[PDB]
Amino acid sequence: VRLEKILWEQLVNVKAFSRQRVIGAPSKWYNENRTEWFKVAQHNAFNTGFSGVILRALEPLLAKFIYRWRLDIAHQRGLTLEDSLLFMDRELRRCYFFETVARQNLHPYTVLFMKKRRARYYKVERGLRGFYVPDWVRKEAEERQLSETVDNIFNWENFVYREYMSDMTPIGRWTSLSKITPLDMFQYYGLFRNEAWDRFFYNEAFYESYSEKEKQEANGNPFGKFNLQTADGRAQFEKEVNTFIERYPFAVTKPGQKFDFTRFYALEDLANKRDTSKYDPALLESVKNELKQSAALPADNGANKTKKSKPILPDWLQPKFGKAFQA
Amino acid sequence: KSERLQFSKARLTDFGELPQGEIPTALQYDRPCRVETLANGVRLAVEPSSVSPLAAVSVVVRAGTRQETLETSGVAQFVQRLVLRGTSKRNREQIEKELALLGGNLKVQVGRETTTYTLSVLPENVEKAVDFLGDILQNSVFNKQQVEAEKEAVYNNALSAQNDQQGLLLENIHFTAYRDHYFGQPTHGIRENLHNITDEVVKNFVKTNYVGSNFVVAAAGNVNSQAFLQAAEKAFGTVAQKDATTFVPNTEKPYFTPSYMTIRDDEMHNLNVGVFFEAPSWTDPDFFTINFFQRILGEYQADKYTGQHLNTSDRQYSLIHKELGNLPDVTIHKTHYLPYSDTGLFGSYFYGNEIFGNQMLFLSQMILSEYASYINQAEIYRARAKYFNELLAEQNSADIASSIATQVTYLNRRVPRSEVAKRISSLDSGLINRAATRWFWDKELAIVTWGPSHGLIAGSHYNRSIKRSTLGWYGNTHYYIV
Amino acid sequence: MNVTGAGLTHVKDFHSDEMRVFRGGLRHIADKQGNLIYGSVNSSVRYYHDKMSYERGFIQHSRSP
Amino acid sequence: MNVTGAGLTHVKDFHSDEMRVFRGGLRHIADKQGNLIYGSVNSSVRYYHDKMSYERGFIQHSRSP
Amino acid sequence: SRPGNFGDHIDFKVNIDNWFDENRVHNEHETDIRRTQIYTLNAIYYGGLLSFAR
Amino acid sequence: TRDETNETSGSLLSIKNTYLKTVLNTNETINYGVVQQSGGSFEMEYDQETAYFKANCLAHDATDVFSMVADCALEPRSTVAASVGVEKNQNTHKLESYLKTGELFNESVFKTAYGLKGLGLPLKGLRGNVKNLSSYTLQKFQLENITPNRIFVCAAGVESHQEFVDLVQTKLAQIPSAEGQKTHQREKSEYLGGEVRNLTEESNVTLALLFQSVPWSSADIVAFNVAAALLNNLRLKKNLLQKYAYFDQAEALNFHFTDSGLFGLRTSGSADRAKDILNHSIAELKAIASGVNADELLTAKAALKNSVLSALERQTDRLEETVKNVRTFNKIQHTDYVKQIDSVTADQVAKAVAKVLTSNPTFVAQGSQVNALPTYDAIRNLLK
Amino acid sequence: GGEVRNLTEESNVTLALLFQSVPWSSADIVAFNVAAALLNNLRLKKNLLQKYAYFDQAEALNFHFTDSGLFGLRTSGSADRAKDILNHSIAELKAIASGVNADELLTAKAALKNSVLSALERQTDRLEETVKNVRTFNKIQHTDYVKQIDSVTADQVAKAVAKVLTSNPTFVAQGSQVNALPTYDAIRNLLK
Numbered sequence A: 001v002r003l004e005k006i007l008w009e010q011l012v013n014v015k016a017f018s019r020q021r022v023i024g025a026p027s028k029w030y031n032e033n034r035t036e037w038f039k040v041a042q043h044n045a046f047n048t049g050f051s052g053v054i055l056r057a058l059e060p061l062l063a064k065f066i067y068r069w070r071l072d073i074a075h076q077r078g079l080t081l082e083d084s085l086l087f088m089d090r091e092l093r094r095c096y097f098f099e100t101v102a103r104q105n106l107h108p109y110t111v112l113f114m115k116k117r118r119a120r121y122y123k124v125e126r127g128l129r130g131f132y133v134p135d136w137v138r139k140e141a142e143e144r145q146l147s148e149t150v151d152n153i154f155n156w157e158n159f160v161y162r163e164y165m166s167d168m169t170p171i172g173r174w175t176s177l178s179k180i181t182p183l184d185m186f187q188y189y190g191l192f193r194n195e196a197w198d199r200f201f202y203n204e205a206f207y208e209s210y211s212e213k214e215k216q217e218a219n220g221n222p223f224g225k226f227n228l229q230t231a232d233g234r235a236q237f238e239k240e241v242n243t244f245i246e247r248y249p250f251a252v253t254k255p256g257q258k259f260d261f262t263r264f265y266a267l268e269d270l271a272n273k274r275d276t277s278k279y280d281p282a283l284l285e286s287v288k289n290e291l292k293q294s295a296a297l298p299a300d301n302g303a304n305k306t307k308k309s310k311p312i313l314p315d316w317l318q319p320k321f322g323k324a325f326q327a
Numbered sequence B: 001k002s003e004r005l006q007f008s009k010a011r012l013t014d015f016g017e018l019p020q021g022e023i024p025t026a027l028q029y030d031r032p033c034r035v036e037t038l039a040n041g042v043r044l045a046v047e048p049s050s051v052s053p054l055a056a057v058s059v060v061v062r063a064g065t066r067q068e069t070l071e072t073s074g075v076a077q078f079v080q081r082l083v084l085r086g087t088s089k090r091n092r093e094q095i096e097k098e099l100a101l102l103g104g105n106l107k108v109q110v111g112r113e114t115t116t117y118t119l120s121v122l123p124e125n126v127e128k129a130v131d132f133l134g135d136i137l138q139n140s141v142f143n144k145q146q147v148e149a150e151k152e153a154v155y156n157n158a159l160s161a162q163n164d165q166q167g168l169l170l171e172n173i174h175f176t177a178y179r180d181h182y183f184g185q186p187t188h189g190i191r192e193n194l195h196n197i198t199d200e201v202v203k204n205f206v207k208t209n210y211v212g213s214n215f216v217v218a219a220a221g222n223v224n225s226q227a228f229l230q231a232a233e234k235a236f237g238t239v240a241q242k243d244a245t246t247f248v249p250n251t252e253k254p255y256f257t258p259s260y261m262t263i264r265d266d267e268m269h270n271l272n273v274g275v276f277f278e279a280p281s282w283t284d285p286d287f288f289t290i291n292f293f294q295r296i297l298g299e300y301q302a303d304k305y306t307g308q309h310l311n312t313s314d315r316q317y318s319l320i321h322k323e324l325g326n327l328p329d330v331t332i333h334k335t336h337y338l339p340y341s342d343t344g345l346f347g348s349y350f351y352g353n354e355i356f357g358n359q360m361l362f363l364s365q366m367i368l369s370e371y372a373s374y375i376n377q378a379e380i381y382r383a384r385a386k387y388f389n390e391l392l393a394e395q396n397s398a399d400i401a402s403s404i405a406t407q408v409t410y411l412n413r414r415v416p417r418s419e420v421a422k423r424i425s426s427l428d429s430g431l432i433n434r435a436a437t438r439w440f441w442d443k444e445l446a447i448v449t450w451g452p453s454h455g456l457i458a459g460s461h462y463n464r465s466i467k468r469s470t471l472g473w474y475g476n477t478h479y480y481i482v
Numbered sequence C, D: 001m002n003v004t005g006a007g008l009t010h011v012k013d014f015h016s017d018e019m020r021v022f023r024g025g026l027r028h029i030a031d032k033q034g035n036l037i038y039g040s041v042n043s044s045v046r047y048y049h050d051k052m053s054y055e056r057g058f059i060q061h062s063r064s065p
Numbered sequence E: 001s002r003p004g005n006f007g008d009h010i011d012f013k014v015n016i017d018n019w020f021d022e023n024r025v026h027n028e029h030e031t032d033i034r035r036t037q038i039y040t041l042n043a044i045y046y047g048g049l050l051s052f053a054r
Numbered sequence F: 001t002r003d004e005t006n007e008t009s010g011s012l013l014s015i016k017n018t019y020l021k022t023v024l025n026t027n028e029t030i031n032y033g034v035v036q037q038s039g040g041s042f043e044m045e046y047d048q049e050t051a052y053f054k055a056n057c058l059a060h061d062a063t064d065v066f067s068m069v070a071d072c073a074l075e076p077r078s079t080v081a082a083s084v085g086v087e088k089n090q091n092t093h094k095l096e097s098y099l100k101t102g103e104l105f106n107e108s109v110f111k112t113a114y115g116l117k118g119l120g121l122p123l124k125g126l127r128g129n130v131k132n133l134s135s136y137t138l139q140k141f142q143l144e145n146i147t148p149n150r151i152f153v154c155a156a157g158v159e160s161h162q163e164f165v166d167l168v169q170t171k172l173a174q175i176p177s178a179e180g181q182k183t184h185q186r187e188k189s190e191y192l193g194g195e196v197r198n199l200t201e202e203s204n205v206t207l208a209l210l211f212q213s214v215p216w217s218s219a220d221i222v223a224f225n226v227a228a229a230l231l232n233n234l235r236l237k238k239n240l241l242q243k244y245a246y247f248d249q250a251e252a253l254n255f256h257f258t259d260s261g262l263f264g265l266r267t268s269g270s271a272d273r274a275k276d277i278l279n280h281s282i283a284e285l286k287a288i289a290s291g292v293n294a295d296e297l298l299t300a301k302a303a304l305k306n307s308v309l310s311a312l313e314r315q316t317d318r319l320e321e322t323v324k325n326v327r328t329f330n331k332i333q334h335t336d337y338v339k340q341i342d343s344v345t346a347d348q349v350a351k352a353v354a355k356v357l358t359s360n361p362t363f364v365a366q367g368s369q370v371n372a373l374p375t376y377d378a379i380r381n382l383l384k
Numbered sequence G: 001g002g003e004v005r006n007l008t009e010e011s012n013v014t015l016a017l018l019f020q021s022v023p024w025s026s027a028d029i030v031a032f033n034v035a036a037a038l039l040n041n042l043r044l045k046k047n048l049l050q051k052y053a054y055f056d057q058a059e060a061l062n063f064h065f066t067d068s069g070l071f072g073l074r075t076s077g078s079a080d081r082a083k084d085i086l087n088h089s090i091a092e093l094k095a096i097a098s099g100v101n102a103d104e105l106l107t108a109k110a111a112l113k114n115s116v117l118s119a120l121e122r123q124t125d126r127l128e129e130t131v132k133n134v135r136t137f138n139k140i141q142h143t144d145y146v147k148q149i150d151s152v153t154a155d156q157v158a159k160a161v162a163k164v165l166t167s168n169p170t171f172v173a174q175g176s177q178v179n180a181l182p183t184y185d186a187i188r189n190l191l192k
């Protein structure tokens, strides 16, 4: 029996209902990046419609009980949100996919520092419970803002998708565990999956996706539709950014300082085609230098190198000193 | 033209594939081919190709090893070499010069049911080749001294036959499959009898076998049909007509003899195993269906296919390639379909490390028998496309000429590309299952294993395990283990 | 010495493909790779048939019942 | 071909000393020769504790209780 | 059809009996009928055993 | 391989071993399944100065197969592809060393001829650099080498040129033009006549003697091809293998490049009496310089015509050599190879070989008794 | 006088140049030992290892046989400068043929005496050399090794090395770029 051409498919998947299967050029499984999908979904849910209106009203509670709670716990542990979000403790401890990807792509320090940061706290917490990280460690924990953790998270997720998740083809499968238990014995993977039945071929065109309009809209201003050129728009934008900074202490600035909006406007002007000399040349130079440095991947200098070992056998494993004429 | 765009996908109205009856547009066209018969019975077929740069002439004579006896075994090997040695018109030096001038691309294939002589030359001298080819095979003079000289060469060839391991294993499966018929004896002949051949034996063989009714001359490439036909008639009009009074040995059906042979040799590092079923003759109704089965099984290499390019062996549409990729050391696998006038053999030959002996022993049957119960449409379409491409891939003049000659000899007709495509494309999963159960399900086997047999000695006899291998899901017990 | 054998002896060493999933990149190891470890009962049960037998030039014929 | 790999592929092969008593002549193989097959649970029960852990230039100090 | 590297047959008398040829019913044609007969005999034996098991 | 440096040597081998692995548009699994279910074939090969991908399929599958081929050829290599390629390259190196294949010997011959740089760079890549074939090195190699002006696209069996032009436009038109931008370019090749003598305790000795013959642009390429055909088909067998029982195998090697060339002999025989093998090979090579007879020339030309036209008859090989001719010379020269072969005369071949003999010999020897061989000056004097 | 040139793709190139020395019977053997002591202790370190960094290691080989002998140098250094490793090495050996300074000769003889007497002080090595002396010279000569070393002069060492250099060279090279080295005739001409 063929799943396609089955009676249900013949009766339902017909041109009359626009449910016909359409065959196009071959394309990879997992065609949609998860990070982009979540970006668009978040924008649609928060900044549009009745759902957006409801979720905007809940910004205080969500910020208090989902962001500052995690941040407070991490700071108590001498950690940041990165330590809990860039690589989940589940992946850090036991995950073979993460282990293989890290071994094949990542430098050891990228995860060694993550592990040692938690080792700092848990060498004391397990010995004596209730450990509160002292101020000096908490300071270095607080130094890093969320604006860099988000960059790391997006970089890692995009790399994982473009390199590994984009080169995977799932298949129908039986129980992974070779367990004699009958309940595990007859586990069937492949049915009850939406992806399994949505497309029966690798040539089928994709029937559900985000429209280009939504994708472009999700890349606009997260805070709202403003006009930074007019003074009225800038005032509202600054008000919203100030309340955001208040809600999230270590998101973009230290919890005691204020955000520099002139530098942000200079960055926006430089990035887009709009330009002018309303900013000081020093400001423009500083902004350009900061932009260059932020996008610069660190490289090795090849300096201050330690000495490599060339071990030799000890003296007792070598012949004695004397050497006379053999004959 | 169907439409403006050659690369259109409109006709693919079945989920990206053509429907059951339809065929690709490229295969809807057939090159011209004219077949004629002469008074002597020699059949001339021409399939010209003006654009091609070469012309190939293939002469197929239905004489073969089948027409030999124990007291005259190996006379075909002497015949093939002696024909070039000399002729009444031309000495050895003269024919050697003539062969060199038009290129050394002369291939002599001494088969069991027939012998083929294929010569590929330039278009401007193709006629000359015919004049040569007709003479060399017709007026050859077999001297005693020449036979004495060639005895050593024939004996060395017989001894060296072991160099081509696949060929020697094919000869072994022929020997084991037909034990009560001379058709089982090796093509190179019995070694100890090679020195017993005389000039008179060769002369009698050629006189009683090279008859007008046994000659088919096929031509392909840049060849002028009229000129080639006229020249071939002039050349081959002097061949003696077949005589009924003459006696042709071994004219009865070589009934298939199931068996299991084991050439145990523990100093080879590798094992050559072959498992074959009785297969239809060239005229059986299930001929192109079994060719489709051959395409389904296909061939495998350890440096290609699932053994080299995939994340996992499961991600493909060839069932046998999955298993072969799962086995690191099973290196070579090829499905051979050899049809003859009376009988035929369809089977699989594996070559690989002896540690996977049983895996190579029980695999070929398991897949084939499984097709008797269920075959996925993906495999059907894969084999369909492969057969289409191979049909469109016959371009070399020598290969096409040899195929034309063989088709004429076994059918007295040139089967066109379109007809073959229509025949194979009409196959369905149900038809595939019915053919497989007719020919493969619960059927007898001819098995040969050559090489280190320390693992296989225990089951070296035709027993229950071998008996149930030709079943489907019942009998895979031994394959999976190890 | 830093060499594997320490510069004093040769060690018959092997890195079993068991306990590994990928031989390279995301590609999987052969399903029956472990069978390439010769002379180990753990590799296969067929190794329990460990009778002594060596022969050359021997041909055997068995006919179907 | 008559080559170990058939002349067109490379085989990761190894003749385990398990099921063999003598290295040569009349001397037994080392008792713990089988441990030289890395990455196999059959070699040792210590392979169950196999969480990822890599370090260079790391020193730790511990004191007697 | 033996390998070339094989020589002449060794003087050792490997076979004392010729049962390979003697033990034959010359029915190369119609082999499937004999196979069905063997299957039927096996079926009878298994049926008796299964009756006892029942 | 000529365009690779020591850092990225062997990148072409990794691409070949993982030529089906792409991630941007289609997956390795899917692009393997496309070839499998299309009934056609897809293959890659690479020479010192070329890298050719070729796929043959049915007309209705043409678009998908072309998209797959373009993605495989032009898409940057991924990290997973890099790892798989490293593993496969290690396996390939082990196999080549184990089998003692003739390619492993030709690698030493090229290294001697041109040095570790340029043409001498091994096709399989340096063995010590295999671990360094990460995605970064492969991508750098592609960026510095793969440019729109260095890409050619070929089709055969196409009803209308414009349709295939549009198909290629939909895929390769994006690649921004590299004209006016700093290109890697190729440094001119230099020929050095060094010698290599390897002791290996081998029962057989293999020798090779090659000389700088001519590039593609020259008019003697046909002459050197005819000379190689005469050696292989007629002279080497008759005068070297048949007469002497210690000659295992002799064959004439002839390679031509955009700016250099190498023509010579490679003969393998018994380890002992290697001096006799060397002297006989030198004498046979010098025989052509002495002269060529009319009958021998006609036989060699007939064999060469047969081989070339057999290659040209098949559509795939004809298309491949059409692409190579177009990329070497703007015109197509494979439609009149017969005329050029006929134009060759014995005097021209003799003069070409005699002129080539005067060059610095490239002499490579492997075997048990390579040490007991004439010195380089002695070999030059013998050739002189 | 054969030559061997093996391409090994080693980051380091190892060269060895040897000539036929005298057998045990000849009295020059002691002189040759002094020559070795003139290289492995004093010269070869200063002239090659100290001045040039690409010289991984250089040493002087001196083997004696009942009917023949071997004497020369074995050097190893950076492959990219293989030629520079060769030329200089030859010069060092050739320098010995040019002459030996009094101070260098005294230092080499003192070092050779120290090594030989350190070997002889141990009873096992003394017994082994006693057996070898009896089997070679039919008498015991290790009792007067010091006198033989003292009797050596710079002129004898220079003449012996000059005579040895005239013999057909034996040249071996294993490295990444051994394919580019002076031809055997060029090697002989440089040695000449």
Ligand SMILES: CCCCCCCCCCCCCCCCCC(=O)OC[C@H](COP(=O)([O-])OCC(O)COP(=O)([O-])OC[C@@H](COC(=O)CCCCCCCCCCCCCCCCC)OC(=O)CCCCCCCCCCCCCCCCC)OC(=O)CCCCCCCCCCCCCCCCC
Pocket: A178, A179, A180, A181, A182
């Ligand atoms: C205490 C006093 C009574 C003792 C009774 C002992 C048994 C008597 C009968 C058999 C006598 C011969 C024994 C030969 C053993 C050979 C194999 C062996 O030793 O391998 C090591 C074996 C483990 O094998 P393994 O390969 O590692 O597989 C498990 C993995 O860990 C994989 O783990 P996993 O997580 O994937 O799987 C979880 C779990 C999930 O399992 C389940 O959910 C399945 C339920 C359990 C099995 C049910 C079996 C029912 C048998 C009914 C028999 C009726 C009476 C008649 C008996 C005569 C024959 C008909 O899997 C298992 O537990 C499977 C292991 C089965 C162990 C029992 C094997 C022997 C019985 C096999 C059938 C009869 C063989 C006869 C041979 C001789 C000829 C007569 O360990 C044991 O045998 C454990 C013994 C524990 C003894 C404690 C008492 C339990 C007794 C058995 C279960 C009874 C359940 C209640 C039945 C009620 C019926 C109404």
Ligand SMILES: CCCCCCCCCCCCCCCCCC(=O)OC[C@H](COP(=O)([O-])OCC(O)COP(=O)([O-])OC[C@@H](COC(=O)CCCCCCCCCCCCCCCCC)OC(=O)CCCCCCCCCCCCCCCCC)OC(=O)CCCCCCCCCCCCCCCCC
Pocket: A186, A187, A188, A189, A190, A191, A192, A193, A194
């Ligand atoms: C009338 C015939 C009755 C026959 C009874 C037979 C009983 C034996 C069991 C048969 C199977 C039962 C149904 C299983 C449903 C599993 C759903 C599922 O996959 O989860 C989706 C869902 C997640 O969905 P998702 O987020 O889209 O994720 C999809 C995954 O990616 C997807 O991940 P994946 O693809 O990796 O999936 C892995 C795994 C799925 O994941 C699991 O491990 C599932 C675990 C489920 C545990 C709870 C099971 C409770 C089952 C109760 C079913 C109702 C029984 C009513 C009986 C009435 C009296 C007869 O797959 C399986 O193991 C599925 C194997 C099932 C094969 C059989 C399918 C049904 C065939 C029915 C027709 C048979 C005709 C005869 C044929 C004879 C031979 C030719 O998981 C859940 O939250 C579990 C939902 C469980 C629902 C239970 C039923 C609720 C409604 C009850 C209504 C009232 C009934 C009457 C009451 C009494 C009135 C008086």
Ligand SMILES: CCCCCCCCCCCCCCCCCC(=O)OC[C@H](COP(=O)([O-])OCC[N+](C)(C)C)OC(=O)CCCCCCCCCCCCCCCCC
Pocket: B372, B373, B437, B441, B472
């Ligand atoms: C409680 C009330 C329930 C309602 C009543 C239903 C009763 C009917 C029960 C049907 C299920 C039991 C299976 C029987 C048939 C299975 C056939 C099969 O497996 O074939 C494929 C299997 C395949 O197994 P295979 O792979 O071993 O076969 C391969 C063999 N070669 C290669 C030679 C082809 O076997 C067959 O091919 C057999 C085909 C014959 C089909 C027999 C059908 C019988 C009809 C059954 C019931 C019909 C409905 C009427 C019932 C009355 C109800 C009112």
